Amino acid sequence: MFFINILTLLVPILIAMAFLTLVERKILGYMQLRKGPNIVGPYGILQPFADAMKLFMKEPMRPLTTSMSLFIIAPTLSLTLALSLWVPLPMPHPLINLNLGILFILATSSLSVYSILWSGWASNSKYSLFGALRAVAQTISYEVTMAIILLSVLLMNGSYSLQTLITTQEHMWLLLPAWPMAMMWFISTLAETNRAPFDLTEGESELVSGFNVEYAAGPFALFFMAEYTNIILMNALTTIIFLGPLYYINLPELYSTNFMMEALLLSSTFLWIRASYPRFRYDQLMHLLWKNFLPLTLALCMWHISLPIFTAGVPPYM
């Protein structure tokens, strides 16, 4: 039965990513005044499956200059962590209730960068090394402030467990008390998922392709599935932390539906941003995060250390 739950979690997530690719292409097309896919099946709903079959049936590459072990581990690790991060998410009940679910999320997402690093370094290609080092810089930029943002908002939740956010936001979104932190969290997630305007680890205009320039067929498909699974996961995490959906002990499905609607809206906002803005420069990203987010992030962290004490609103433990 736990296996049935594993399936009912994983398979819908994979299908959601598969059709998020199509939704991205169509939203971009319409915002750009074109239609997007609409031949491959009704309105193009078979496009993701066509692409997956084509990619997995295309010949896979074993370049002579690569280190095969890391070259092949990196995509596997990418997809593994992409899927694993979904495990502790409450919706409203997690598949795996963890006391430190948020730290689990942080550690797993941080480890996920090593997929890009090792793939780029094992490609033994100059553009791949460029992409790997840009991933290094991006991680340095955003990881420092993401943790402090999470701590600042968790000083109101009272614990690291994700499931406690549902009862913290039982009467009001955490966005309202901490919308300034919500904005920086949103930008940090945008940078973490390697998405535009921070789409630098794979920057077609500057690097033909970034880390995954020597990757063809199935390994490339693994990378591109991990990316969109992470996009959906991060938007869901925002939806749960801030934008707390409705929870009634007798109506778990209402929480499920509200969460799905809000996460869908936020993912569509990701695609909207990608269609709107131009790209950053991988030094400008670090300068932004270190000269406009870190100062204000520290200020708000100390503000939220003070707030419970001087309002006598210290959260309960357990």
Binding site: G36, I39, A50, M53, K58, E59, E204, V208, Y215
Partner: protein
């Protein structure tokens, strides 16, 4: 009905995948790349047919030779064609690429990209209309539809 029938249906699925998703390599040499850009543009929108560009040759299927191939460029064109993983197809758009075009009798032009790589489709024109290139892509899709690799394997 028969294992032959099952194999034919499987190969039809194979070709459906390949022809529905074919990713041309971001590659353009001269004027004709402008008409390729216009076929990308909203009015025709290649993406509607599932044809999206990719910069890396490792993540491309069809190479659209769009413009004059010179002697200084031919080795690089062959290298990117080779580095494309199989299966891979070639559409030579424009007169420069079909044959020699205006510069056929020049000391620095390869008289036809088919002298360097085996071409799958030829699109006449100087430049061909964006609709003409789209027609060429459709013809390539029909070619992919009539493949029967698995049926050949089973008979073999």
């Amino acid at each position: 009905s028969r294992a032959e029938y099952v194999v034919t249906k499987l190969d039809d699925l194979i070709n459906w995948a390949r022809r529905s998703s074919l990713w041309p390599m971001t590659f353009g040499l001269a004027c004709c790349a402008v008409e390729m850009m216009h076929m990308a543009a909203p009015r025709y929108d290649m993406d509607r047919f599932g044809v999206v560009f990719r910069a890396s040759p490792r993540q491309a299927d069809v190479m659209i030779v769009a413009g004059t191939l010179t002697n200084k460029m031919a080795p690089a064109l062959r290298k990117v064609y080779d580095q494309m993983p199989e299966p891979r197809y070639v559409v030579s758009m424009g007169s420069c690429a079909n044959g020699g075009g205006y510069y056929h009798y020049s000391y620095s032009v390869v008289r036809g990209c088919d002298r360097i790589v085996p071409v799958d489709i030829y699109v006449p024109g100087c430049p061909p209309t964006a609709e003409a290139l789209l027609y060429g892509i459709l013809q390539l899709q029909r070619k992919i539809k009539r493949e029967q690799k698995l049926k050949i394997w089973y008979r073999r």
